[PDB]
């Protein structure tokens, strides 16, 4: 039933958006056609909105020709904008997780913060946690974002706080919980790591911990995520 499933995705209900929209996906040129409409009149976001983020990415997994080709006409750089303090450019890191190529997406985003420290830490190619605290808030948030947004809210750095968070910040409790370390086991980059949404909550980003938590721990405790409401 297309119209009672177009209105519960118009309804307020998350959850009961979600599985309309999985349903409507399936649902051939009139379902796909109610999610085209849904887009239209919510991209671009001004606030991320895990249903748009949804929708958009259920409809490029489909992988139809149509389909992609009409949403990177309207939505060429998708759906939430690509802003940076730095004049950064994070359309590629948008394009890989359009894609669900999370692994490429992680070395971009590795790289892009290191752009962000400045020229010593993209010289050296890792960061201090100084560097980290002193992050523009706003790129912080655009990175965040397309993770949250391209994951169905699986991915993130949000998402890592919010488990630190859960955990009485013990980040020897928080490694387990991303899969980030089996027991005695560190999982090993860049093999061990399951580059898909199969991957437990909060498992990407990486963020390497051969020079201890610092980085991970300033990163979790800058102001962004309280400021933009992650
Ligand atoms: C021995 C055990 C450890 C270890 C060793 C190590 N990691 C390396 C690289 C590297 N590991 C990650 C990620 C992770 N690696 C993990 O184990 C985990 C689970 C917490 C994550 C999440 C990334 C993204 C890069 C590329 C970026 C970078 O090099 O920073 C290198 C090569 C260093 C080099 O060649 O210079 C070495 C030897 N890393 C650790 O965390 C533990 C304690
Ligand atoms: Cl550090």
Request: charged share 10%; hydrophobic share 40%.
């Given at each position: 039933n297309l119209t009672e499933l177009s209105q519960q995705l118009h309804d307020a209900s998350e959850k009961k958006q979600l599985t309309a929209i999985a349903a409507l996906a399936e649902m051939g040129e009139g379902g796909q056609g109610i999610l085209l409409d849904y887009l239209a009149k919510n991209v671009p976001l001004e606030k991320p909105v895990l249903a748009v983020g949804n929708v958009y990415q259920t409809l490029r997994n489909l992988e139809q020709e149509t389909i992609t080709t009409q949403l990177q006409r309207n939505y060429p750089t998708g759906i939430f904008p690509l802003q940076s303090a730095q004049g950064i450019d994070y359309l590629p890191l948008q394009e890989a997780l359009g894609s669900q190529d999370f692994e490429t997406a992680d070395e971009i985003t590795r790289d892009k913060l290191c752009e962000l420290a400045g020229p010593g830490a993209s010289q050296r190619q890792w960061l201090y946690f100084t560097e980290v605290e002193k992050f523009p808030a706003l790129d912080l948030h655009t990175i965040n974002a397309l993770w949250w947004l391209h994951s169905n809210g699986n991915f993130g750095f949000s998402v890592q706080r919010r488990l630190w968070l859960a955990s009485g910040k013990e980040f020897t409790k928080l490694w387990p919980k991303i899969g980030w370390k089996s027991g005695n086991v560190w999982t090993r980059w860049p093999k061990g790591?399951?580059?898909?949404?199969?991957?437990?909550?909060?498992?990407?980003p990486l963020l390497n911990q051969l020079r201890g938590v610092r980085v991970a721990e300033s990163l979790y405790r800058h102001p962004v995520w309280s400021q933009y409401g992650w």
């Open positions: 790591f399951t580059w898909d949404l199969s991957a437990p909550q909060g498992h990407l």
